[PDB]
Amino acid sequence: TPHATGSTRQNGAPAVSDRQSLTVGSEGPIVLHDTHLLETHQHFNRMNIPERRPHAKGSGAFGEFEVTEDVSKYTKALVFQPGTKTETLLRFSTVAGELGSPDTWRDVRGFALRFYTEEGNYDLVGNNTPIFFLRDPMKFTHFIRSQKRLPDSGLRDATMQWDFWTNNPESAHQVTYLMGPRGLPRTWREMNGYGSHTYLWVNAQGEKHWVKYHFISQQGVHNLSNDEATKIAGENADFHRQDLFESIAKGDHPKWDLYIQAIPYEEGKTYRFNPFDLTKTISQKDYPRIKVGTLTLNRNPENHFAQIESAAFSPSNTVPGIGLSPDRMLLGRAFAYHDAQLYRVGAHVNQLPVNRPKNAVHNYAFEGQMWYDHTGDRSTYVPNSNGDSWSDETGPVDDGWEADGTLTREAQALRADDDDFGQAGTLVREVFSDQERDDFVETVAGALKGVRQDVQARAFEYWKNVDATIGQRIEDEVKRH
Amino acid sequence: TPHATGSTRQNGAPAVSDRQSLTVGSEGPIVLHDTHLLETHQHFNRMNIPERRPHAKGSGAFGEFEVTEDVSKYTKALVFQPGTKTETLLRFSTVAGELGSPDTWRDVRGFALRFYTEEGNYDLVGNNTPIFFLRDPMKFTHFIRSQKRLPDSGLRDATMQWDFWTNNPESAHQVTYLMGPRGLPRTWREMNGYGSHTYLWVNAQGEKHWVKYHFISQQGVHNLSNDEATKIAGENADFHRQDLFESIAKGDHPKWDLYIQAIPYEEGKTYRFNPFDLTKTISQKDYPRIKVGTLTLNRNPENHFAQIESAAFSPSNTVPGIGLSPDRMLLGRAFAYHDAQLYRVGAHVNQLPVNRPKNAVHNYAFEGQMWYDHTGDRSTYVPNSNGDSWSDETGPVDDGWEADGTLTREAQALRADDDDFGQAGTLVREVFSDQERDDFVETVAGALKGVRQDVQARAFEYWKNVDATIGQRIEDEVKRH
Amino acid sequence: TPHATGSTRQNGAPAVSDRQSLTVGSEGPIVLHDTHLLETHQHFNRMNIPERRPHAKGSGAFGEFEVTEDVSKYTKALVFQPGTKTETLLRFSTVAGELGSPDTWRDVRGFALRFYTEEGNYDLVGNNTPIFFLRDPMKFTHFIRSQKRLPDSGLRDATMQWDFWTNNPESAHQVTYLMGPRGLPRTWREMNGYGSHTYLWVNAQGEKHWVKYHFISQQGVHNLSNDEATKIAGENADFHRQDLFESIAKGDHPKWDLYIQAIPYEEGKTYRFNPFDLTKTISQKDYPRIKVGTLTLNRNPENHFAQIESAAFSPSNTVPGIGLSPDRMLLGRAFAYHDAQLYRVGAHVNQLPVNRPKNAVHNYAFEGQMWYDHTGDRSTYVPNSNGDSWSDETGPVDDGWEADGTLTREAQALRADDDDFGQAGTLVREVFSDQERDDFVETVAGALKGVRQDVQARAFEYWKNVDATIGQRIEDEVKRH
Amino acid sequence: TPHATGSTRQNGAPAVSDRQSLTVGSEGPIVLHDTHLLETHQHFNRMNIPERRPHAKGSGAFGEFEVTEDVSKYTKALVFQPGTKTETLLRFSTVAGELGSPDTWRDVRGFALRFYTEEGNYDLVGNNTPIFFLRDPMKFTHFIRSQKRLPDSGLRDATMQWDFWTNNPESAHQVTYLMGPRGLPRTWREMNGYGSHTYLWVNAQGEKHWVKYHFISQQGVHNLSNDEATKIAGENADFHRQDLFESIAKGDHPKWDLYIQAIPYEEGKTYRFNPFDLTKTISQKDYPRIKVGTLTLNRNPENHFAQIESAAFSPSNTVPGIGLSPDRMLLGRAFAYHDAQLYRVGAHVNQLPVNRPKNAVHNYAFEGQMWYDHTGDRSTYVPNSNGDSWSDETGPVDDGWEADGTLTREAQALRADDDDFGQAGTLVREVFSDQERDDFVETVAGALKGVRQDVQARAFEYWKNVDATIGQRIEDEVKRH
Numbered sequence A, B, C, D: 001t002p003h004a005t006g007s008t009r010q011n012g013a014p015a016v017s018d019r020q021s022l023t024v025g026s027e028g029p030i031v032l033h034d035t036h037l038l039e040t041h042q043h044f045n046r047m048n049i050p051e052r053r054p055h056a057k058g059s060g061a062f063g064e065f066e067v068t069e070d071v072s073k074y075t076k077a078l079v080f081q082p083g084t085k086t087e088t089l090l091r092f093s094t095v096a097g098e099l100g101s102p103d104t105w106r107d108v109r110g111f112a113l114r115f116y117t118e119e120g121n122y123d124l125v126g127n128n129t130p131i132f133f134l135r136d137p138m139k140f141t142h143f144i145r146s147q148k149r150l151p152d153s154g155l156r157d158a159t160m161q162w163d164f165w166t167n168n169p170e171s172a173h174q175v176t177y178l179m180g181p182r183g184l185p186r187t188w189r190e191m192n193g194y195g196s197h198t199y200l201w202v203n204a205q206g207e208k209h210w211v212k213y214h215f216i217s218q219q220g221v222h223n224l225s226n227d228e229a230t231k232i233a234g235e236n237a238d239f240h241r242q243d244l245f246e247s248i249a250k251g252d253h254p255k256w257d258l259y260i261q262a263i264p265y266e267e268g269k270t271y272r273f274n275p276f277d278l279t280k281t282i283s284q285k286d287y288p289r290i291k292v293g294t295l296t297l298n299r300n301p302e303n304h305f306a307q308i309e310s311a312a313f314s315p316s317n318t319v320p321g322i323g324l325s326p327d328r329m330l331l332g333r334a335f336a337y338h339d340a341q342l343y344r345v346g347a348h349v350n351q352l353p354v355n356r357p358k359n360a361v362h363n364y365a366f367e368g369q370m371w372y373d374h375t376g377d378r379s380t381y382v383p384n385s386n387g388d389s390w391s392d393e394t395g396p397v398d399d400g401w402e403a404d405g406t407l408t409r410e411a412q413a414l415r416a417d418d419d420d421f422g423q424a425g426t427l428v429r430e431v432f433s434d435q436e437r438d439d440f441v442e443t444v445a446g447a448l449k450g451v452r453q454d455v456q457a458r459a460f461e462y463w464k465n466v467d468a469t470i471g472q473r474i475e476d477e478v479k480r481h
Ligand code: HEM
Pocket: A051, A052, A053, A054, A055, A058, A091, A092, A093, A109, A110, A111, A112, A125, A126, A127, A132, A136, A137, A140, A194, A195, A196, A197, A311, A312, A313, A328, A329, A330, A332, A333, A336, A337, A340, A341, A344, D045
């Protein structure tokens, strides 16, 4: 245009200057009607949004999922039908640290995967562990607070962390996994991902299986030592973010193979470990892995904030053929994510490009702040006599199950082999090597250093419950100093 | 898709039912993981946004502006060059009432006009009056609060309104206009619009004129009586909204002619009324109207909320060739609108379709909640060595003026004919007819009924200052009851 | 202080002027560092908060509840033990109109009552009707949207309202009540309040009764005609608000008597009308009213916004001895209110004085915006070893019940006398008088005027289902015009 | 109370369990009406607020300021009158990193000090440097973005930082200070604080001086090496936060002495360095330091979030006797802080206990979200006839100055010794030691490693402009690798 200057204000008119304010002479005050200054500063002041809680610190990439086996006998979901290729988005993260925190702290890592399927966005929001610390969502707020900062000093605190874990012994399986080698992945490319929960798969005939998801890295599982991780935390707080971005940019596209475990509907009720208990794995002897397909990440974001920070994943984002399960943790998650995203991003978070599905949305939601894609004169109510369609399926849902009882607050009933310490003990005695046990003792003793004496004594009892020998070695190492 | 049901959730998957919740059997409780119920209720709960303050209650339409005369000697603005046609949006409103308040209350009406020009959105945010009640923005918050509700009872209150007006005698010109016939327009189609403020026009050679805008209705000015307006308020609270929507729908497209008054830069400093005082008109004897063009409204909104409620107008939205003026009220407005819109709508209010310009925006603003149109890897700083342009014009701005003095808080200096009551007195004695004066006395006496005695006595003095005779008639009518 | 000026800025320093802005000389521009101007305008721009949806328009008063009978055999709740006196807050409202809408429109009225009890705030959030239009919360968003504005024009629309009601015939009982005399209360003092839902009462021995609440006005039930209500809507949009405020100010304190109906736990499952269906009343022949006590309103708010607009009521605010019931509508409400209030007011809405309980709050919630009353160094997790207490009751809850079934979306099962039109027909034929039936025909025919022909035909069928004779009279009146 | 359980919900009623959710039998789904679960999760999801931008990462303490000298000849401010003792709050921070970022990165440190004075909160919001990188606020948004993350990868980037600095050569003085020893303080206790800007002091007779503030640590200035800082960043990201909290807890109370430089009003216009240019120091030869008093920090926060994270400091928080100056940067800050705080914390941020003044606030601001301390029935407008006071001082303000010119966007005029590189050159050649110059060369060469070649070449030219020798050594070190 004839009056252009190189940039505009928000109304599209020339900005005049991005470098100097509007003043009364060169020595005078800034005037109130420097609207370019006001607009740019007001926007700057509103750039930051609340960080996620948990999983604030993370990054990710786009890719593709390709089905390479036939699992139509287990699910009718379009995404998993033979040959299907689907675009994906994967965000990796740590659990406890804030936006600016080092990537190489000892922590659980998130593995949040979206499939842009032809029947909607399917989100599989997993971790780099098959289990979690808890089995009821009422405890989750407590757990995450115990992993963050003391209320007075603003410092993370080992006493608080161990006080919570030792008073919640359901934590023992995941704490063992976390304190083992896998607590410190070398890169996100060299860790596995897991759904952790049991999900329901429903086939075209209406038959149900309980499934676990396992994403096995084709780059192998590789871990850092405590010393190596500390050093990297000081040298490069964004070590994992950079590693992923630079690997993809140079064409070194990471891959994972997806396998499921499939338990028949009726055997879910009788298996010796509760499949609806998030602190339990399903033995690969009883239920071996079945191959589904391969995930590849092959495209970096163009804008990290718009495509990764503003991405909103939810386990509630199921597609036909895939349902939730009786797992209390999973049912808590069905509520919590969308709720957080309305505050963190806004009411219309799911209209942002990264969160939009590929298929047509026809949803009964109107108005609200920042409504970019309005529904014109579509009817706002159902049934209507205006030809604007609605859903009205009645009766049992395809992805459901049964329940019976009185309203209660209590622990899940124990199956034959259920307890708090058994699987942890197997991991320590049978899965770890001798050298991994030595490292484990050092890791756990390091973590208990400076823990208040009463809590430290409870931690020794906890580790002896996991394994009498490991527990004694940890106590001896702590007392040796 | 094969599993469709008639509508979707927000992730695009089938909703299953828009009519029944997910329960444990037909008689059981609703389950927490009824995510369709949660999403639709959470969205419903976030549909309402803060109403505008002031001007909450309003509606509008799209149209066109066509230049039919040559005013290139006064401005280089593209919108006003010979022959130019521009799409427009016009929102009409009342000042004091809330979202659900009757259209036919006695009030100032807003006349908010946007031109989608080739060099950006130009907003002329006017009223149905050429003047306003005040001449310094510090008093505006006080004024609007006095026009709303008492803090204890939540009732509008005549005592509060007259207490403010009589203690702020600058109000007299606009209060006279408001209490006259034009306080009650029959329809928005039958009222005039005015910029009210003086604006600066700059031509291609850099010469400046001070201008006033006058939009003269081609449907004439027609008004209701007090009794007629009261009756309509009870029968149809949305009388004006409906009138406009139904007039356009049946092809009865309303029109206004735009005229300006143009005062040479140097005569602005010497004119006998202060052109930078928003309580003053410029006499049509001294500065006659010059025709510019014609505004037509010819298209109803498709979605009232997205296109009218979410529209964000600002006097700060100037285009090259048009600037603000020394008027303190106008300079206050340059800050206030954008600020309100960041809270009312959101940081990215100007990315909503109705607020987007027609030309390319290249603005240094990134991130924030609800960022729909991201800037990819564009540089976030200036100067940069990446070929992402910026503005850096130095020296006096084209749409500026001079100032000199010490930092002060005080009234504007009086010109030869400036005072608080003169122009009001002219309106009453010379512009109104005899019958309009009779109606005026009745209107003002009605408004003063039940005003607390000390404030009512100050109101009699105020009206006698406007005109000794009108004031005595008002006092006599009030005392007669 | 020695430098005082009459008012302060937000930091407590002298404001200097509430009336003039800071300028470069008397004729110069406003400077950016007029911080008093900025602060007052930025606050002004953030004064408005989202209106409630529904029930935007309302007002209320404080009072007292006094138990005058013995109902300890039905509940252990402290509020209802013999002799107990409790402070109360009552907010009245209409359902569909916005903040500025006339009080005297035909509508359901809200009757929202809080008791500040010694074991927490007990909220009984009722209406001026014992029933509602719907029995599943999934339909509530649809219903409220159908009662508001068309998406294109922003007008309320009779076709939309009747299209929703006739396609949802469960609506017939409440629509009959609404179109009858009680749709237009003369004052809030002259209407009854009802809980509408069945609630659970639990006594000290753990025995359960299902209860309905009935608040019978001691001023009687008095109603306006259509013509009278229209006239008042034009003359005084705040007629009910003013009536209540002025009645209390002059010592005319309104009173209601509270009665319950009490159904034994086991008879709830077998009664011939479903007590868990919000469209049904419980016959006073089967279950007569039992007197509890008297509510009096005797104190106006000191600040309407802080004490009434910012009040946050929720059916989830139960106290020991009182629980929710299997009613799907009530269980939907347990989620929805708190969710809306977090957006409308803020995360810490329940720390505002009006929403705070009288007893000590010891809640596991920390941080968030606007945290006025912080918890110092209290532990943020449970169990802790720091002596900060927590709750851990296990097993069946005292205020619970049983369920069994598969996850389904379907209508509640019908009891012996359940249907959509029976109770409506009783209200029309047996409860109304002859003159009330004549008025009813006129009201309903008036409401159907200008309803689109296909929807109007469905409305005639609907009214004939209610009562063959009333339906024919309505059709004949509509066709007569 | 008789039904207590150990904790409450938000309404004060017993929570029943903080550890288990409400389910249909022990194996069943969670019910929607688990309101304790919903409330605790909804609050958890709203705990995080937007981090500050800049200065996200910080901590602080309470203390006292004691005047020990007589400066009444320079100011009438109550806080600085002989003998006066005032409570203080001090927040320390880094500029560029996010909430979780290591304390021991090379950066400017903030020194934000509040005095709770008897005439309002006085905020002196300083840095650990007397200068800044820029002299016009229009460039500040650009600068801070260049110090944060690349838009595509989310990585901090040396090229972006040096591209901005070398294209903005006004940056040279502060960049030299930053790349010197003081870029890495050992603890916050061992750094100085400075106002950086010139402020105006006005005495009881109305005489003005331009002042600079200098807070000289009584613990001395001590710094880390690059290697030491890197190591600590990996071992303890919260090293400075912990150091301060633990020093105060053990009674090792840090102290600073406050000195001012005082330039007579008229000499401000003629001094050879522009005192209104934030990139310039005032020579201690021309204007020696004058002692005022001593700051001590002696009390840790009880709640870090409520007292430190939610603290809202602003340079606009002046008190009588202290004003802003012509410095464009300072005038930009007068707007920006309050604006950011309305979004970050909320409209009523200044009612939170930490932000409240000690004296009585009488401010014309009403309503808004989260209004804890309402104004009852106080008048909402001025003048009023209700005895609610207001300010109306007219004429020149006590803390003002003069201006004259046309509206312009351009660089400040140069004084006799003003340029971009002179003071930087003095710091390098005269203030640093030989060993500090060696470390400087290593620091700057390290920072330029991997900077894109075109930008690196501009950086060599920039450092040669600072000092021909230092610049050549830096170039040689970079090329040596
Ligand atoms: C009851 C337990 C849990 C609750 C209440 C919960 C809640 C949340 C919330 C509120 C967020 C932030 C969402 C946002 O702002 O966008 C989040 C993020 C996340 N959660 Fe959970 N969570 C739970 C358990 C788990 C489990 C068991 C896993 C893995 C199996 C998991 C994996 C994640 C991941 C990967 C993210 C980050 C997603 C992303 O990258 O955006 N969480 N969680």
